[PDB]
Design a protein around this ligand. Sequence first.
Ligand SMILES: Nc1ncnc2c1ncn2[C@@H]1O[C@H](COP(=O)(O)OP(=O)(O)O)[C@@H](O)[C@H]1O
Ligand SMILES: Nc1ncnc2c1ncn2[C@@H]1O[C@H](COP(=O)(O)OP(=O)(O)O)[C@@H](O)[C@H]1O
Ligand SMILES: [Mg+2]
Lengths: 197, 198
Amino acid sequence: QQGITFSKNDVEIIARETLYRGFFSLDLYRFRHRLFNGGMSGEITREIFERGHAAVLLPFDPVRDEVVLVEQIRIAAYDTSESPWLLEMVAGMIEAGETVEDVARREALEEAGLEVGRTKPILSYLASPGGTSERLSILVGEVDASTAKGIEDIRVHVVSREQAYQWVEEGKIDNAASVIALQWLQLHYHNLRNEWT
Amino acid sequence: HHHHHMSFSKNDVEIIARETLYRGFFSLDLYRFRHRLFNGGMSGEITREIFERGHAAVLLPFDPVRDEVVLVEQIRIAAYDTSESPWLLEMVAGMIEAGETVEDVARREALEEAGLEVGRTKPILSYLASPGGTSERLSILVGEVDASTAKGIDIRVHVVSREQAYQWVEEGKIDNAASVIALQWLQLHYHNLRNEWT
Ligand SMILES: Nc1ncnc2c1ncn2[C@@H]1O[C@H](COP(=O)(O)OP(=O)(O)O)[C@@H](O)[C@H]1O
Ligand SMILES: Nc1ncnc2c1ncn2[C@@H]1O[C@H](COP(=O)(O)OP(=O)(O)O)[C@@H](O)[C@H]1O
Ligand SMILES: [Mg+2]
């Protein structure tokens, strides 16, 4: 099939407004856009949670078939989870001029004590584009999982790939970045082990 | 050093306050809380801004006879700044109101967003979209559909092969969390799913 029909030049962002500015922002976009029927929308407003964008690293040890996870509290999980302490990927915000790879390698070293060898891109995704602009770009990084060490009150975990994926299936890992990375690993680990040996 | 799998509760968190920062269509709250530390003791009072927009039900519409998936296309303006286009190919989805089940919402949105009656369902998974800054949880089901009944009922409905939809995930043409998660799951499970549903 065709895939999507329209691009940026088919929408006019009339103006934006910051409704709240603190650590993060809440912005109001005012815009018009082309309709699938040909016409041009009326003026539309949407509230958009703006918090910058992130780099994510899945630390994979291809020799051991293990991943490294980081555990820490995410208070926003409280209301819909049995515990707000989550098992997650290495991640960090991307500041201006930084690259995904730079941030990913830096965070693996200081959150988990991991020197990263080769990296490969996994996927870059929008976390929830109806309400937030946030994009997260995921890499897989080559590590020796036996060297993992924890140093922002964080506990470092080493688990087999198979157990980490079973925990996705069971709901014990249930944050988007980790689910997406570990599903991708379940689809690609044979090729990745072949490539990284 | 690290905790190897082969070798805290909510009583360990004190939510002191939730302070309203913004109330409009969505909400922004300041959570003020304390929590137990891995090395013992409690943290001091910590504050976090949290985007509150409720929770959602997501349905991956899968025709197992035809090995096809139904996608819905619509503009998501928050995608603008980082995407080639703000029109996104997505799963059927809708907010869960109080007292509604994931299954009720998923089946309703499928019918109204895409004209699909849904047969059997299976859970895929339920995930937190971005738990450092938002409480939003999305619960995905796979739904059995007859893809030759999909019709747009501003939204455009696409019917594509599963292999095409998954190739679009690989290429980045589908890159929203819900659709990526659903379609990666389908790629891991379609062989057994198709057999169970035929
Ligand atoms: N980001 C937003 N800001 C303000 N209103 C919104 C926003 N997103 C959705 N809405 C409101 O909710 C309705 C449903 O929009 P849609 O995004 O298609 O559903 P959902 O948000 O449940 O996925 C719209 O008519 C709109 O008025
Ligand atoms: N939702 C938020 N509200 C307020 N501040 C935040 C939020 N998320 C991150 N920060 C700030 O960014 C810093 C690093 O964030 P991160 O490492 O992701 O979370 P934390 O270290 O608090 O578990 C924190 O010290 C905190 O001040
Ligand atoms: Mg970080």
